[PDB]
Design an enzyme around this catalytic site. Structure first.
Site, PDB file in Angstrom:
ATOM      1  N   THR A   1      45.955  36.587  38.431  1.00 24.63           N
ATOM      2  CA  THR A   1      47.028  37.024  37.554  1.00 24.63           C
ATOM      3  C   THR A   1      48.338  37.393  38.267  1.00 24.63           C
ATOM      4  OG1 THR A   1      45.209  37.858  35.924  1.00 24.63           O
ATOM      5  CG2 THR A   1      47.453  38.652  35.674  1.00 24.63           C
TER       6      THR A   1
ATOM      7  N   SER B   1      39.796  33.980  38.932  1.00 23.08           N
ATOM      8  CA  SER B   1      38.665  34.582  39.690  1.00 23.08           C
ATOM      9  C   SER B   1      37.374  34.619  38.835  1.00 23.08           C
ATOM     10  CB  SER B   1      39.092  35.875  40.306  1.00 23.08           C
ATOM     11  OG  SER B   1      38.966  36.977  39.434  1.00 23.08           O
ATOM     12  N   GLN B   2      37.485  34.298  37.544  1.00 26.67           N
ATOM     13  CA  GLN B   2      36.309  34.117  36.662  1.00 26.67           C
ATOM     14  C   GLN B   2      35.519  32.886  37.141  1.00 26.67           C
ATOM     15  OE1 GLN B   2      39.569  33.798  35.707  1.00 26.67           O
ATOM     16  NE2 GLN B   2      39.763  32.580  33.835  1.00 26.67           N
TER      17      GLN B   2
ATOM     18  N   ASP C   1      39.291  39.891  37.821  1.00 27.26           N
ATOM     19  CA  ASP C   1      37.933  39.758  37.210  1.00 27.26           C
ATOM     20  C   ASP C   1      36.768  39.906  38.216  1.00 27.26           C
ATOM     21  OD1 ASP C   1      39.501  39.363  35.016  1.00 27.26           O
ATOM     22  OD2 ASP C   1      38.787  37.336  34.649  1.00 27.26           O
TER      23      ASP C   1
END
Lengths: 326, 303, 303, 326
Positions: C12, C35-36, C67
């Site tokens: 982000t 990062s998910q 995340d």
């Protein structure tokens, strides 16, 4: 789009330093115009009107600024659809409470500030002020009493306090929680304060040019009685004790406050302790000494209620019933 | 099995048969006050009785009222020269109450006083299954049993099944690493605390300046800030030969330098993460050594 | 002025001119995922690129999605052999947003990567003016900028005015004090996580046992407890030659031994304060070394 | 004095170990009678009636126990003035929610548990159960939906969760705060949940002998799709994703849940993250995939709402509007 009036009072959101990096800043140097033009996206959600009422640091907030805001909000109520009040962090919780008991405009009244100065990197003031306007513009914000909107969160004026000295997230209702969360310019309102606020209070400041004199005294190990005494010698209408634990008082402070309650000074037991009620029925006989328990009100907030109580009654038991309803 | 001494002071906790499971539990009543009446004299007694009786025991437990536990823990933290466990305990509920907290608290305070791993971590507070350092620990709620928390730097370890997994130790200098020697002193310098809020009276701060107080701590607003009247009276007091420390009524975060207050211009001392009552503790002991704002501030940066 | 390398991963946060004030700021894009979608391969790259390029720089900053930041920080914490500052940073708000958090976060992550005091504290996460250790740090809120907190043992220090007052250091063994050498490995053991709740299906846990998963971590209820179906399937799996670690879906406190689960009877491992995703990190790396429940549990007690 | 019915289900409050010191205990061994007689002072505030409905650890709570409690509370409503439900800590938040959406008794329904076993030193269960009875006996507790009373604090069934694995204070409404605090057997109620509860919900379990099948899947780095797949192959009516951050899903989990939403399985995005909403309009197109945002509901709570939603509609957009109102 609804008509929103910003009343500016200064604070860190209108604060300024020679460096974006360095933490050094001063306040009272930057006008409302500047704050609005730093948030262009405002014109998407409201017709914004700025009035400067004062430009001070909120460490310098006082009775006469309080009277001026209420009278002004009360007077100008039907010439706008809502107010945002830009204000300092430091006593925001004191002014939100005072306007919570004194505004009879049941249209949204929303306080906003900031922790980082307007000049600084990742300054919080812009998004904060935007989110104050969303909240002030949201019909569901009406009749919730006076609000503080900080860090995507809508807090009630009664329970809201500053928790941290530097953190952009410092503003919290540490006792009963927030009212709603702001995401993408919408609010899911899940709570309204039950305590009586705004047009449900008997408090009328429309004619006062003064407020009763009420001082705060701090308790701790080996606490001096000299501050308690100085307030009495000046013939103070009321005193609030920042007690230790469940609103308890060091021996020396206790005896001076016992005396004054009997020569007719209102004495309210609060606590230096950040959360929780100063309860009746614990280690202190309140009814014996003519003391009032603060409940969830921290000392600075019990001051606000007590100054307002003293304008209707000097009677200990009616002042208790006011601290049980407001 | 360890020799653990219990110093009783009174409070909401003043019979736990299971103590014999873990220690030889000898116990002396030093005083029996409510901790709202805690004073410098109790403090000097505790400091000395522990400094003297150190060789005699393997560790200490101090039953204390909850109200001023964080002021006494930090005082003992800066004055005690025994680096054997010193453990303070109280209770939020009376001993005559349903589910009284006091019994298990005392148990776990003796587990902590008897753990060799607890040595050299400074004076500790053990409440609600938690080992907390005497510096950062404070009471956060007027009535909750989980009130005691290290709200800035967090706890040193959790007690489960009479065992402690210690994952942290306070870096600020404590006990035998401090120059505070209190063994000859029979009084501490007079330090006051004054509160900031809107339309704050200057009469508390003036009263203290008039008594010839050695030190005054401001419970400022926000980041240690002062209402104008108080700022005027304290600016005056800082060169009267009254030492002034800026702390905050806000219950977490540091009172920093380099904010809105030019501290060197007034001879003021930023308290850091020391809340007002804790700041008075360090300010009192700093003034047994210096009245130098520059050097007082150096001590606020080290202990 | 220090030589600080920024490894970019995406997230982000992906122009801060004031970086030149504090460091020579060289920067390489390792991957650009949300990062998910963080995976073991990104992890092995980061571990190696830092272990190799250690002599070349004075410290590291790793821009990461928020995340899975707590899984990557703890992995790097147990695999990195550079005891120069390694600092992870992200942002909750986009770079195209009012009051974006990312700019000041990067600034303060470079303050932290350049502070010599930051050395030998393990892999760090710097968010919201706060230095957090890679082990205890997790995200507590889906959208708040103050989300990142060390919820069990608290933060190592606060960053104010480009300075850090460090009052704490993680005791659990990190970086060069761990036997996890990842420089030769091109995959990690397959570890799953299954969730406990009311009427919990045994089909997630069964699916994992059927794939021949090396390890399974239970997001238990309360103190690591398991719904009966899951308890039955996992009790079976622990002697199939699948290693089973009991953690909790509860976001603070330890999964303890000596509660309701006889761990030695099933060959189960209590996670301690390791939440499930963190427990998978240690469980994966434990299984590069042993499949011994007794010895896996010894590693859960040391790192 | 009012008539209060305790329905026992077991848990740690009815739990037992061979030592008061050691942390070792088992549950399902100790009857309600025992719990009542360990709290003598009860007869001062209520006429207490104990029924054992089950004796299990709440790690073993299930659909059929849920149906039995609602039907029972619904049936026995007008034969008592309130209910306390003694229950385990572990899934208390799941059962409180379920009864919050299913009981049509608007008389106080109050869940209580304990963290330390009944045998252990400074056991919390006694004062906890006493405080459950105060709350169940307090007329002001009516119409607040279903409550959890733990550690002197009255929590709403919707927002209440366990925060710590071992702490007597673990129970918290981490999003919107508690409703009231209990001091000396009295409550100052300052909040009521705004979301629709009890007799304001369309959910009727009076005839179900089953609940729709809904599983939870966890997200993390390198997350296996095998758990998502296993639930689909069993033809599950719904799946809840414990997403990472703002309810986000690892690639492999995402594609399997995309497929199932199109063969008609209800997929709800929640979060493993302890506080905060899984919002619409963030990184996921919900309306594109036929996904529903959970809001403040954590995965175990979104399960409860979804099982109940699936008994009225399999339509993604009506299931979204149910997760916006309840």
């Amino acid at each position: 789009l609804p008509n929103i009036t910003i009343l500016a009072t200064g604070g860190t959101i209108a604060g300024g330093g020679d460096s974006a990096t360095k933490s050094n800043y001063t306040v009272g140097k930057v006008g409302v115009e500047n704050l609005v033009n730093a948030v262009p996206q405002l014109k998407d959600i409201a017709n914004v009107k700025g009035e400067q009422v004062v430009n001070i640091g909120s460490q310098d907030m006082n009775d006469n600024v309080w009277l001026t805001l209420a009278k002004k909000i009360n007077t100008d109520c039907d010439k706008t659809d809502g107010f945002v009040i830009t204000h300092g962090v430091d006593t925001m919780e004191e002014t939100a409470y005072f306007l919570d008991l004194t505004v009879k405009c049941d249209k949204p009244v929303v306080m906003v500030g900031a922790m980082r100065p307007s000049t600084s990197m990742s300054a919080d003031g812009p998004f904060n002020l935007y989110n104050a306007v969303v909240t002030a513009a949201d019909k569901a914000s009406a009749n919730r009493g006076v609000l503080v909107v900080m860090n995507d969160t809508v807090l009630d004026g009664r329970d809201v306090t500053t928790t941290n000295t530097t953190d952009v997230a410092t503003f919290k209702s540490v006792n009963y929680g927030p009212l709603g969360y702001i995401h993408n310019g919408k609010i899911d309102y899940q709570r309204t304060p039950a305590r009586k606020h705004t047009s449900d209070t008997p408090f009328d400041v429309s004619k006062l040019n003064e407020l009763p004199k009420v001082g705060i005294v701090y308790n701790y190990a080996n606490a001096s009685d000299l501050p308690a005494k100085a307030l009495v010698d000046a013939g103070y209408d009321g005193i609030v004790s920042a007690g230790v634990g469940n609103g308890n008082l060091y021996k020396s402070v206790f005896d001076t406050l016992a005396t004054a309650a009997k020569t007719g000074t209102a004495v309210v037991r609060s606590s230096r302790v950040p959360t929780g009620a100063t309860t009746q029925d614990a280690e202190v006989d309140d009814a014996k000494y003519g003391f009032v328990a603060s409940g969830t009100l921290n000392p600075q907030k019990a001051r606000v209620l007590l100054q307002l109580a003293l304008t209707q009654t000097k009677d200990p038991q009616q002042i208790q019933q006011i601290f049980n309803q407001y």
